[PDB]
Symmetry: C2
Subunit: 171 residues, 2 copies
């Protein structure tokens, strides 16, 4: 519906030119909507970006819930696939949240939540190493995204090959 359309247009504009550099006026113009339509769904630009992040986080929560019986390697392959599909939001997450002073806490809150869930999953078969593995693997996944999605946009097969080999070495 309209809320979905606003979210899509906002993700596009924030990806293209940042949160600070995009106004509600530009968003509604691009979406061919009135300001009233926007404010009916979002009370502020702040609520809007928070929802964008929240919805991608929810896909991550779903990923963990729906794949808790998979091997760590397969769960991680799925995690990378979702992040790649959501790469515009990943870009916003880094440049508009981590890089900000106001939203830095959200960036870390979401990472910590993903880390807690990943740890819980790993405690099942690697209890004494789950804490360590979560740091290593999240660090490795972030290195791959930063260099092969953010610095340069490589195609997904390349990232999957890198992830697969690194996880094989680790496990």
């Amino acid at each position: 519906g309209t809320k979905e359309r606003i979210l899509e247009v906002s993700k596009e504009l924030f990806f293209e030119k940042g949160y600070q550099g995009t106004s509600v006026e530009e968003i509604v113009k691009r979406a061919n909507l009135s300001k009233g339509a926007f404010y009916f769904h979002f009370k502020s630009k702040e609520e809007l970006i928070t929802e964008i992040i929240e919805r991608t986080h929810k896909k991550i929560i779903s990923l963990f819930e729906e794949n808790k019986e998979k091997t760590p390697e397969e769960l991680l392959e799925m995690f990378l696939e979702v992040l790649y599909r959501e790469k515009k939001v990943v870009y916003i997450f880094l440049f508009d949240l981590l890089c900000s002073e106001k939203f830095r806490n959200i960036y870390f809150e979401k990472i910590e939540d993903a880390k807690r869930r990943f740890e819980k999953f790993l405690e099942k078969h690697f209890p004494s190493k789950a804490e360590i593995l979560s740091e290593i693997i999240l660090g490795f996944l972030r290195q791959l995204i930063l260099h092969y999605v953010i610095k340069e946009e490589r195609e997904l097969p390349f990232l999957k090959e890198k992830l697969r080999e690194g996880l094989k070495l680790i496990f």
Copy 2:
């Protein structure tokens, strides 16, 4: 000398309030120097931050050159110690270079150089795994710095314990 004093004051101010939010006037005022003294050593604010990064990078180059005969675990322990001592510059590197549009390329150039050197070091005893290990280990080290130096400033012993256990698991 004077150049060193300017560098120290600039690292402090950029750490405290960012590159964009710090002026040459504030730097020379804090250093009790004239603008002429500043311009004798730096032609611009851009040259100044570039030199700050270049000097910390040089400490990294030295680290690799001076410890090429150490075990990977010990070389990495030293790498973490230097990054921790240089944590104000690490903070500037992320928030003033990666987060910028103008200086993003420098952030990646330096990381790539560190990665190339680390890879070369690892090719000696783990040729077929050096490329993979460099991604994993740099990712892991970055995860530890981001969460335990940037998000919250933990003391060095904690970071070293985390690094030690993760490298033991990897190697």
